[PDB]
Amino acid sequence: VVWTDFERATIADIFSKLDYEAVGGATLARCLIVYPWTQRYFGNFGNLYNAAAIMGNPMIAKHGTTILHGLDRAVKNMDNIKATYAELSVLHSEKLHVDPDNFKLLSDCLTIVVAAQLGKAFSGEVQAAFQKFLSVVVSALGKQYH
Template identity: 30%
Template sequence: MLRKREQKLIIEIWDRLTPVAEEIGADALFRLFTTCPGSKTYFNHLDISARSQHLRTHGEKIVLAIADGARNIGQLSETMADLQTLHAYTLRIDPTNFKLFTHCLLVTLAGYMGEDFTPVAHRAMDKYLSAFSAVLAEKFR
């Protein structure tokens, strides 16, 4: 999976981006809903227009959970256990949406980080977000 150097880089990136978690999350969610309209199904009761307060609030929750997972990457399944259960049994989210969201998040991160989103950072973040998506989807198997 991730080498120690990649783990350190991912933690550094999320520590730097946590203050703008709301913006990053809202942008990534809006990108998801725009490019994958079927993902809106789970959000019919919310205002999902660009930069809406619902997107900002939910986006921040997602980004902070991802950042928390990065800090506990060695125990990702344990750290995300409550979210696994919530998404699988209560919300019944199609696990394909996790992968779609992480792709949208990668694009958003590239925009926010600019030149700092190097190929090395991109590869490390892609590996981490793939692991994060897989962990969230574990309860669906």
């Protein structure tokens, strides 16, 4: 992948503006509520009976923070994302067997959480750079056949 300057700086700017714990937790909660079959991957993560239960789950808040810091890792290694994610790819595919469409679902929840926070600053060109970044990330997390 080849980053333009706008893409590179948009990505750094977006993350510089995010509370990783706040955004992480909202994002993962959002995904387990809007797409409930994703709960099954997180079987030992406490109570997930209902919206309000997912919302007050300390473990889901903790893991949302982890996801966001995992993303920040790609932001710190923009030109080496595949390699940076090689171990994460193996976990999510070989051990956890996460169907790749779930990566897109979680990505979409993040975008909408980000959209609601940044408002008018989260423009089409900005969402463009953010989607390109998530696309690269999602591609690096999926099974590597090459």
